[PDB]
Amino acid sequence: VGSLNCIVAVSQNMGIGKNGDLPWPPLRNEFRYFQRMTTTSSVEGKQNLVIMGKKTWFSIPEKNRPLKGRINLVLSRELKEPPQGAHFLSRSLDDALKLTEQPELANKVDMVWIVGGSSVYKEAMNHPGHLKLFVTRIMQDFESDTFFPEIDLEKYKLLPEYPGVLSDVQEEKGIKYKFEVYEKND
Ligand SMILES: NC(=O)C1=CN([C@@H]2O[C@H](COP(=O)(O)OP(=O)(O)OC[C@H]3O[C@@H](n4cnc5c(N)ncnc54)[C@H](OP(=O)(O)O)[C@@H]3O)[C@@H](O)[C@H]2O)C=CC1
Ligand SMILES: Nc1nc2sc3cccc(CNc4ccc5c(c4)CN([C@@H](CCC(=O)O)C(=O)O)C5=O)c3c2c(=O)[nH]1
């Protein structure tokens, strides 16, 4: 299995969700960025795995579930089986990551992408080891009821460049945003 990564889009006030959806109206190119990052694998005959909590799964419109071209894993202790259209179910983040090295997945999985929500981002971000955060900074405040955990910059270095990530300010629907990549190894 390859690298472990988180990806998120987050307002200035650290918001990531409101009422089961995003705090901001749809930013179609930002969504396509998310698809490109999470789906693209350099490794032949492998795909990337997405790991998400249950509410994040159900926040993706059913049309777009599962996220195509990726293996979709949902975290839940209440569900007894993966939701319709999902591929796997795990009871903890530790369990999910251990599953990626069982026989079934061991030679199928390239990158692992943690796609939220708040509690899985927090536990991953403090998981010892090599981890990257792909953070889109939405450069406005938006009313939110779900928030991104603190990024400890004494361990997460903001990288000064990354191949394939645009460095300039983006703007859709009158909302400016910019892409960042952070890396720790502890
Ligand atoms: N802006 C962005 O980039 C993103 C935005 N979002 C937004 O965030 C909101 C959803 O996130 P959030 O509310 O945090 O909810 P989550 O997606 O984290 O779902 C929480 C549910 O997931 C299960 N769960 C979470 N973590 C674990 C774990 N480690 N092990 C086992 N089960 C776990 C639980 O289910 P159970 O009770 O069944 O055990 C829990 O009640 C929505 O508004 C969505 O739109 C989400 C992702 C990204
Ligand atoms: N930087 C960032 N991180 C995260 S982490 C994360 C976890 C869950 C949900 C979201 C945002 N909600 C979405 C709802 C529908 C779609 C997508 C995302 C992507 N999707 C397509 C492509 C677009 C299409 O093909 O129409 C697809 O992936 O195949 C969808 O159809 C984000 C999200 C986010 O918005 N931005």
From Swiss-Prot:
What organism is recorded for this protein? Homo sapiens (Human)
The answer to whether keyword Nucleus applies is no
Taxonomy, superkingdom: Eukaryota
Could you say which disease the record links this protein to? Megaloblastic anemia due to dihydrofolate reductase deficiency: An inborn error of metabolism, characterized by megaloblastic anemia and/or pancytopenia, severe cerebral folate deficiency, and cerebral tetrahydrobiopterin deficiency. Clinical features include variable neurologic symptoms, ranging from severe developmental delay and generalized seizures in infancy, to childhood absence epilepsy with learning difficulties, to lack of symptoms.
The record's catalysed reaction(s) read:
(6S)-5,6,7,8-tetrahydrofolate + NADP(+) = 7,8-dihydrofolate + NADPH + H(+)
Q: Tell me what happens on changing residue 35 to K.
A: Increases affinity for dihydrofolate about 3-fold. Reduces affinity for NADPH about 3-fold
GO terms of molecular function: dihydrofolate reductase activity; folic acid binding; mRNA binding; mRNA regulatory element binding translation repressor activity; NADP binding; NADPH binding; sequence-specific mRNA binding
Found, by tissue, as follows:
Widely expressed in fetal and adult tissues, including throughout the fetal and adult brains and whole blood. Expression is higher in the adult brain than in the fetal brain.
Say which family it is in.
Belongs to the dihydrofolate reductase family.
Q: What does this protein do?
A: Key enzyme in folate metabolism. Contributes to the de novo mitochondrial thymidylate biosynthesis pathway. Catalyzes an essential reaction for de novo glycine and purine synthesis, and for DNA precursor synthesis. Binds its own mRNA and that of DHFR2.
Q: In which pathway does it act?
A: Cofactor biosynthesis; tetrahydrofolate biosynthesis; 5,6,7,8-tetrahydrofolate from 7,8-dihydrofolate: step 1/1
One GO biological process this protein is involved in is: folic acid metabolic process
Residues binding substrate, per UniProt: 30-35, 64, 70
Q: What is this protein called?
A: Dihydrofolate reductase
Entry-linked InterPro entries: DHFR, DHFR-like_dom_sf, DHFR_CS, DHFR_dom
This protein's UniProt keywords: Cytoplasm, Disease variant, Methotrexate resistance, Mitochondrion, NADP, One-carbon metabolism, Oxidoreductase, RNA-binding
Task: State whether it acts alone or in a complex, and with which partners, per the record.
Answer: Homodimer.
Give the DHFR domain ranges.
3-184
- GO cellular component terms, A-Z: cytosol; mitochondrion
Q: Where does NADP(+) bind?
A: 9, 15-21, 54-56, 76-78, 116-123
Major location (coarse): mitochondrion
**Compartments (UniProt record):** Mitochondrion; Cytoplasm
Query: What EC numbers are recorded for this enzyme?
Result: 1.5.1.3
